[model samples]
Target: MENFQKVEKIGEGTYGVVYKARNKLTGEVVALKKIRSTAIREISLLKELNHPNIVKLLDVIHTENKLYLVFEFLHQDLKKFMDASALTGIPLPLIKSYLFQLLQGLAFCHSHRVLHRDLKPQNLLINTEGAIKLADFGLVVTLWYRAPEILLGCKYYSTAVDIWSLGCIFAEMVTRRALFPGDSEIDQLFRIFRTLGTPDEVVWPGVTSMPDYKPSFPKWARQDFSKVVPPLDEDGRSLLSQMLHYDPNKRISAKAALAHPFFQDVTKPVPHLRL
Candidate 1:
């Protein structure tokens, strides 16, 4: 905490309050995450991760009472961008580009066995250069978008959970709203089921064994993507369909997603401009 000079309070996070700060020596802007000592997972996980899309952990300071995580300073978070109408009605091609890069980042994280359970507009960070970075993994593996096993109260889950969130984020980017938003967990699940149809033993085997599995889920139903997003062209709708599949195993991997026609003519992988 004392190593970096505090700039201003950025915002409150799940694990701690974020502040803008500056390095005393190089005078570079940075984000200081004042994580609670009790939130060991965020600290440990942040230390191990190093992806362009993932927030960069610059330094970790452990004190007798608390933990201070220093990170590269980002101009603004996705939430701020969304609130300021920066994501409204973005061009389809640009949206596709962003989604592809997002998958690319997720692919790297998934390859490393990391699950960004909490993926949303706000959890994404965009810079003036059009680069997007996934931010915040605190609510990762939480109730929303959690795999069926976790919903059943199973202790173990996998990268597929992050795939679900990716699908949701993809939808949100298109519509500028949540894909399967609901009033509660049950409602959220139902919204998902209604959109993609209900999951079964074949689609998601072992779901019944989950501790929180409920047999009396609402009746299986059909939903029309056009009704939700009437404007999506064929390719746009196709990408959405693949991501929102009921079977996690059937969902497209981030690496495979790069080959999809959606990103056929994209530039090389460079920041958000991917080159």
Candidate 2:
């Protein structure tokens, strides 16, 4: 690796340590990511992705023992925002605005056949300019956001897994905490069922075919969706239902979600943020 002045460590991420660095050539601020060789998939995946909602990977370099990724700088991340908003639980309008942007980014990736796989708050980045970008594709599974199957364990899950994570993200935005931090796959499903109820063949037809499709406590009474997410108002609840659909096919795509009433008055590139 060529010697460049170390600016400062930004934060530790799923892949590696992120740094706010200055490019020696242009003296421009950029994010420099150091990925462990074990997680090099981000190198190829990021290179191939190009979307406004998705973080742009500018360059990739490898040294004898380290892998370096250069990325466009973003001012803050979703986790930081969530942490700061903990006291107030994030206003409803603001949550709607963020979810709208999140769907936009996911729509772009889904269109390109990419699954973020990890759509948690920590993975979404928001710049000071109010631009939202999805970061980290290291765990991208084949299926976009499908529910976990019983037989295949975690192996048979699909893109809907991302949708599930998105639902969790939405819940976090509303409750200011994760709805399902289950320790195991089965436990996770149970938690989801407790909140959102178990999937029915009518709503989710091909669930049986999923490798991990066993119903846990099949007799558990269906939960009231409204009761699970008590914090959100009516409008927020409506959006929440769509994002957390058990059926992957029925889940709302990012593009379609933007047309929802949630964004009716929200501005793009953020209506309130100063440029």
Candidate 3:
């Protein structure tokens, strides 16, 4: 249980620092995360999440107040990987295929009642096969992504936030930029409202009950998404629109999103991984 050689440092993780490691006997590689009590929550969650597109937590061990979590090591993250794509020049069809797989992964998680509240390119790891997997599933937060209800201080919420971020990442894939850039909470809301239109309970029922809701907030009409990312096809725009929909309650479910026409052109993205 305690026979891995920690190789190279991966990076600072939410709960703790991570390292590349190899099994001493098998010479197999893996990611070993050492954490204290901070990872108690993660341990519980990751144990429950199992999917092909998810980072596989291989094993766990305890050693003198530090807990070791073993996970399959993967090569790249979607954020830097996509940024580097400028030279390799990835095409739109490949993008559709990747998004399709990401959606399937999310659908699996959502069906099991797990919400990847913080979804971003950095948390999406890609294996050698080009499949994108969701990481950092809600054991914490990232300033890069917070759904409207969270920004509005919704004391309680659901899977819609995950959908929102999916839309954000989807757009970023299209334009190679963040869908919303922010300096502060207020500014973030302004960018969202101005582009997607201000919302009400009519738009998102029970939003008036939000502690942060204000009738005095500026009202803006939704802009046609086409103008924002003209390069996106009609089907892509339609699917993205539903994803970025103002109402979390009404936002497209991962299951529903899976059936969206956008993925029609994209066949199976990544085949089942078998060794």
Top-TM-score candidate index: 3
- For candidate 3, give the lDDT of residue 32: 81
User: Candidate 3 has which clashing residue pairs, if any?
Assistant: none
lDDT of 2 by residue, 1-275 (tens): 35455589988766678888888777788888887754465457668888778888988888767778888888777777878777866677677777777777777777777777656676788876667788867562222222544223546455566666787788777877677767655666676667666667776787665666655556456677777788777766777788777676777666777787767877544423322
lDDT of 3 by residue, 89-188 (tens): 3578778878888888988988878887778888888866767788756653355566888888986678888888888888888887777887788888
Per residue, candidate 1 scores C-alpha lDDT tens digits across 1-275 of 66588889978776788898888787898988786634566567667878777778888778877778788877776655555554456666666667877888899878877787767676788776667888877443234444444455656666777776777767666677666656666766776677667777767676666677678877676678788767676777777777766566787777877787867766533233211
Kindly report which residue stretches of model 2 are placed more than 4 angstroms away from their true locations once superposed. Answer: 37-45, 139-158, 215-218, 268-275
Q: Which ranges of candidate 3 are over 4 A from the true structure?
A: 37-45, 87-89, 140-142, 268-275
Model 2 scores a TM of: 0.82
Task: Evaluate model 1: give its TM-score.
Answer: 0.85
- lDDT values for all models: 0.70, 0.70, 0.79
Sort the candidates on TM-score, descending order. 3, 1, 2
Model 1 ranges with Cα > 4 A deviation? 37-48, 86-88, 138-149, 267-275
Full-model lDDT, candidate 3: 0.79
